[PDB]
């Protein structure tokens, strides 16, 4: 039950969601860029981008603004699910080509 990993920044959050900034510690461009790509691949997402506010801190601030269909949290959760699925496809294809060789 990790309660420190991902936080919701309330000052950056709208009413009823659909626009929220998340703070993700121990994260950098690696997860930020893949997550942003996958999240932009969602029709309801109108805005996605991350930022590492300072190199000294291992912190990532990812901003999601959606249209009214879904909330930023839902778009985030969908982005994480889709990133997992994509990496699973990559794993299967790569292990198959390794086995074939």
């Amino acid at each position: 039950p990790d309660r420190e990993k991902i936080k919701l920044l309330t000052q950056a959050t709208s009413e009823d969601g659909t626009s929220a900034s998340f703070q993700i510690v121990e994260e950098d461009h690696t997860l930020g860029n893949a997550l942003r790509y996958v999240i932009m691949k969602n029709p309801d997402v109108e805005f996605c981008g991350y930022s590492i506010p300072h190199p000294s801190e291992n912190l990532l601030n990812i901003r999601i603004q959606t249209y009214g269909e879904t909330t930023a949290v839902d778009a985030l959760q969908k982005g994480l699910k889709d990133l997992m699925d994509l990496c699973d496809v990559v794993e299967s294809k790569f292990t198959e080509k390794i086995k074939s060789m």
């Binding site: 292990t95 390794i98 086995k99 074939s100 060789m101």
Partner: peptide, 17 residues
Amino acid sequence: VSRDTWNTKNMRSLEPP
């Protein structure tokens, strides 16, 4: 080569400490 070393071995380093 042509070996699925990762399936054969149960990884431990890769999990977060």
